[PDB]
Scaffold this active site. Sequence first.
Site, PDB file in Angstrom:
ATOM      1  N   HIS A  41       3.875   6.245  -2.836  1.00  0.00           N
ATOM      2  CA  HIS A  41       4.664   5.677  -1.761  1.00  0.00           C
ATOM      3  C   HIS A  41       5.762   6.554  -1.179  1.00  0.00           C
ATOM      4  O   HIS A  41       6.472   6.088  -0.283  1.00  0.00           O
ATOM      5  CB  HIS A  41       5.297   4.348  -2.224  1.00  0.00           C
ATOM      6  N   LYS A  50      -8.565   2.594  -2.605  1.00  0.00           N
ATOM      7  CA  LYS A  50      -7.425   1.694  -2.402  1.00  0.00           C
ATOM      8  C   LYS A  50      -7.485   1.126  -0.985  1.00  0.00           C
ATOM      9  O   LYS A  50      -7.456   1.902  -0.019  1.00  0.00           O
ATOM     10  CB  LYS A  50      -6.096   2.364  -2.622  1.00  0.00           C
ATOM     11  N   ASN A  86      -2.291   1.058   1.640  1.00  0.00           N
ATOM     12  CA  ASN A  86      -1.194   1.758   0.999  1.00  0.00           C
ATOM     13  C   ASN A  86      -0.137   2.204   1.984  1.00  0.00           C
ATOM     14  O   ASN A  86      -0.442   2.745   3.047  1.00  0.00           O
ATOM     15  CB  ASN A  86      -1.725   2.996   0.261  1.00  0.00           C
ATOM     16  N   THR A  87       1.119   1.975   1.632  1.00  0.00           N
ATOM     17  CA  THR A  87       2.220   2.360   2.496  1.00  0.00           C
ATOM     18  C   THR A  87       2.940   3.572   1.924  1.00  0.00           C
ATOM     19  O   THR A  87       3.320   3.585   0.743  1.00  0.00           O
ATOM     20  CB  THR A  87       3.217   1.210   2.682  1.00  0.00           C
ATOM     21  N   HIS A 139       7.968  -0.343  -7.724  1.00  0.00           N
ATOM     22  CA  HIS A 139       6.898  -1.091  -7.067  1.00  0.00           C
ATOM     23  C   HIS A 139       7.231  -1.241  -5.600  1.00  0.00           C
ATOM     24  O   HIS A 139       8.390  -1.482  -5.229  1.00  0.00           O
ATOM     25  CB  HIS A 139       6.718  -2.478  -7.713  1.00  0.00           C
TER      26      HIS A 139
END
Length: 130
Positions: A16, A39, A42-43, A125
């Site tokens: 991230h 995946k 996703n950022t 997270h």
Amino acid sequence: MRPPQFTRAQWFAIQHISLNPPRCTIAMRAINNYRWRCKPVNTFVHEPLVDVQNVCFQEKVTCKNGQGNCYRSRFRMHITDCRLTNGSRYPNCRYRTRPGRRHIIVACENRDPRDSPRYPYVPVHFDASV
């Protein structure tokens, strides 16, 4: 899943935080190398590491999972949303790259002993891109 060779904070950074402007199809490869399916979403946060770490001292909010240890960035941050294309079949994962600038929400916790002692409380997270 988090590869056991990485702490939660380490895996958070790998997935991230982007020093360079991310091109999703290139940037996701390092992530999918540890996975058995592409995946889907996703950022990446395209900001200096310290700015992303500092969100852990900003606006405390409830996490999506109900835990209390989440924080919303004070400012809009530069982000890139990566979404898997409809034709992608593992192991060849292609992504649409959707850049933007939004507030982020991250969960934070005390560092693992394997994390650098210089940052005692760190993001672990990625909770939300808004």
